Amino acid sequence: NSNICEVCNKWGRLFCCDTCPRSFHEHCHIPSVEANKNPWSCIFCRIKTIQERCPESQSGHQESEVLMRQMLPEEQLKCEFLLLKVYCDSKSCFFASEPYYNREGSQGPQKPMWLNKVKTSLNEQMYTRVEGFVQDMRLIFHNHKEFYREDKFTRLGIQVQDIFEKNFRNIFAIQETS
Ligand SMILES: [Zn+2]
Ligand SMILES: [Zn+2]
Ligand SMILES: [Zn+2]
């Protein structure tokens, strides 16, 4: 197995996957690494199994159909994985914890949102459709763009949104377009 966490790239107290060489901090994995389970298979492995059991699941889909799906176990897992792919980027640090807003010439968002809030919401099964999760995720970046205006710091929101959107299209097999 790897000697660093797949998500944050640090050593520490690592739980190792039994079916692939990845390792994780307990709360870096999503869901948090399960108490028992021998063998244990990481989220990457679990997602790969879904694809292998249903190869046609990789054919293209329309985003509008994906968003309306109910959060059954496989869609729950896919959203967890997509959240984890965002935390994999070090720039997610800016969006992880609860923000505050006090900048001359700007007003804070009406509905603040952050990664850890989305993480809790998934853990608590608060989303009934994929659309709930995707809307909160996109809101993170939209709030940031609006608040930071013409400051160059706005670019961090564009960057992390691009990671989110690329991974959304991959994990949910969105039909490729020009
Ligand atoms: Zn970690
Ligand atoms: Zn694995
Ligand atoms: Zn099938």
Same structural domain for residues 70 and 38?
no
Q: CA-CA distance, 81 to 87, in Å (whole number)?
A: 10
- Distance from Cα 137 to the centre of ligand 3, integer Å: 29
Helix axes 115-123, 73-87, angle to 10 degrees: 160
Is residue 31 within 8 Å of 25, Cβ to Cβ?
Answer: no
Q: Quick one: which of 136, 139, 141 has its CA closest to 161? A: 141
Experimental method for this entry? X-ray
Same structural domain for residues 38 and 69?
no
- Distance from Cα 24 to the centre of ligand 1, integer Å: 6
Q: If residue 163 lies in a helix (H) or strand (E), which one and from where to where?
A: helix 154-171
Question: Where a domain ends, among 59, 78, 93?
Answer: 59
Same structural domain for residues 92 and 54?
no
- In the chain, the amino acid numbered 149 is R
Of the listed ligands, the closest to the CA of 51 is 3
**CATH code of the domain containing 46:** 3.30.40.10
Same structural domain for residues 66 and 52?
no
Same structural domain for residues 109 and 37?
no
- Domain housing 131: 60-178
